[PDB]
């Protein structure tokens, strides 16, 4: 017989309103080899990647399990692991090419795993990993914000400051760079919240962005980081950004015109937090290390959880609801589902 | 009366055929103020920007283009310190100012280089716009001295035998330790691009990724595309290292950035007009880089890319030179020299 576990998964990619779009299932409990740890998952969060996968990609397995955020306890370690031991509390995102965190136990490479912040509970920690790695790599590996753009305003504009990535990216920009942080939100309440997360200025992305930034009287931002609606804002971004500035996007515009950026010699940077573990690059262990840095900043009180919606337990009914909420594009912050049971 | 000069220019953007596509004209001779120098122009080159501008952009009464020159400093503005009358110079200038297609030309002292002593006027005129393009692409945009983890320490230059490619290969070879892989499609351009410094030359009439993989060096950190970027974009995204960097200087009409997402590859524009168009604090780096280029030329480390020399500078020869650059068949650089008959 095989030791087993509960999981949430699917076999037919489908809109969330289909009954079998996500199903409660039972699967063999895996065991860790090499550099993998096995984590007893305590909570997971839902990201736009989860619905994009779910709607399109079938198992290659009778079941496909997704989830790219967890916090949990290390249950067992492969023979090559040196970074964690059983009992350690961890948070991490994992890898798009490996079964995901929507299961009681989950394998993940020790090198992309962070120590869970002690001051957060399971759900508050689970809100953070994917979005933190996305923002941190965007600022420091892609944009390279500590390298100045000559003549620019020492400023970054974060488009979509209230969503999953925005709500951690604004805090990281405020606590770990000397930039002036300009973030966007379009209802008074989400504006107030982005401002409370650390944005120095908050502008309204229902208005043309360039005129909004010009009115602040700070000059032209060196950096722009766009988390959503890049095609609607691309021209305004090219207008407001400094010559020789740098623009990073993480969304998937379907007709982005790079020629808008030519006259200013602006670079366009993708950030995909899956790239490092997917290709097994030599700096892949930077993801575990930055998570440890984030974890320390959380425990010092410099960063805080972006959890705004908590559901329980992790089952299909609650994952479906969390997916529909992320699909809607209207939620602020992060939705986390915690526990297994009834 | 006004002191005057010959120039070549146009008043209606057109295809290179119209009798009016470019015209011989006479204009007032400018005088420099501020930080400008006035240059007595000995030779100019034609670059693709010339025909791009000529096709599309109208003028004050007449538009004068040309973005490459070598010449003698005739006069200086009162704020100039970097040059004096009699100095020999080369430079590209600015797309928002009248161009070098005239006996005398105004350009800001800060974007100007000392002309290599070892080159004649036409050989030196071949170099500045393409030198600034390549030098900025490598060192300011791609930042090739910062390695991509796990990538081959290599740069692919697509279109090695064109105007920018022919100097970019040399600058990459002389100023970095990268393996320089460049593309060319005829045995004659292949041998030439090899003689310019490329460690490997591959054939761009073939799918690039399989050509680069055949080299057995791994996946290049960097790609610098000078021509046909849309034709090669999918191949470039297959061959490049994850977290690599891709710079293009042509003008693809359908470029798909989503090809580069999976590898998290950055896409970098290089336009040498940006710094002097916007008057950025680093504008004077263009004059400095031209001085380094000049010194490398006279050291023997960079060679002129001049391959076609016409005389004198008039509308007849500029039309032929524009046709040549529009065809995309020329290797190296076409330069026109002198004013006369």
From TrEMBL, chain B:
Keywords: Metal-binding, NADP, Oxidoreductase, Plasmid, Zinc. GO terms for molecular function: oxidoreductase activity; zinc ion binding. Pfam families: ADH_N (PF08240), ADH_zinc_N_2 (PF13602). It comes from the Bacteria. This is Zinc-type alcohol dehydrogenase-like protein. NCBIfam families: adh_fam_1. Belongs to the zinc-containing alcohol dehydrogenase family. Quinone oxidoreductase subfamily. Residues 20-336 form the Enoyl reductase (ER) domain. InterPro entries: ADH-like_N (IPR013154), ADH_Zn_typ-1 (IPR014182), ER (IPR020843), GroES-like_sf (IPR011032), NAD(P)-bd_dom_sf (IPR036291), Zinc-ADH_QOR/CCCR (IPR051603).
């Amino acid at each position: 017989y095989f030791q087993s576990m509960k999981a949430v998964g699917y076999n037919k990619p489908a809109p969330i309103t289909d009954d079998a779009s996500l199903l409660d299932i039972e699967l063999p409990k895996p065991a860790p080899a090499g550099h993998d740890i096995l984590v007893e998952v305590k909570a997971v969060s839902v990201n736009p990647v989860d619905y994009k996968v779910r709607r399109s990609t079938p198992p290659d397995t009778d079941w496909k399990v997704i989830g790219y955020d967890a916090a949990g306890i290390v249950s067992a370690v492969g023979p090559d692991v040196t970074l964690f031991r059983p009992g350690d509390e961890v948070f991490y995102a994992g890898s798009i090419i490996r079964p995901g965190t929507n299961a009681e136990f989950h394998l993940v490479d020790e090198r992309i795993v962070g120590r869970k912040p002690k001051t957060l509970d399971w759900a508050e920690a689970a809100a953070l990993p994917l979005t933190s790695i996305t923002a941190w790599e965007a600022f420091f590996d892609r944009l390279d914000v500590n390298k100045p753009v000559p003549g620019a305003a020492p400023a970054i504009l974060i488009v979509g400051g209230a969503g999953g990535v925005g709500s951690i990216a604004v805090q990281i920009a405020r606590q770990r760079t000397d930039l002036t942080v300009i973030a966007t939100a379009s209802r008074p309440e989400t504006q107030e919240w982005v401002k409370s997360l650390g944005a120095h200025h908050v502008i309204d992305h229902s208005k043309p962005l360039a005129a909004e930034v010009a009115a602040l009287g700070l000059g032209a931002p060196a950096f722009v980081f766009s988390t959503t609606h890049t095609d609607k804002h691309a021209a305004e971004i090219a207008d407001l950004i400094a010559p020789q500035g740098r623009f990073c996007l993480i969304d998937d515009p379907s007709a982005f015109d790079i020629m808008l950026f030519k006259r200013k010699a602006v670079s366009i940077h993708h950030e995909l937090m899956f790239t490092r573990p997917m290709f097994g690059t030599p700096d892949m262990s930077e993801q575990g290390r930055l998570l440890n840095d984030v974890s320390r900043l959380v425990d010092e009180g410099r960063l805080r959880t972006t959890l705004t919606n908590r559901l329980s337990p992790i089952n299909a009914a609650n994952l479906k609801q969390a997916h529909a909420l992320v699909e809607s594009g209207t939620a602020r912050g992060k939705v986390v589902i915690e526990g297994f049971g009834l």
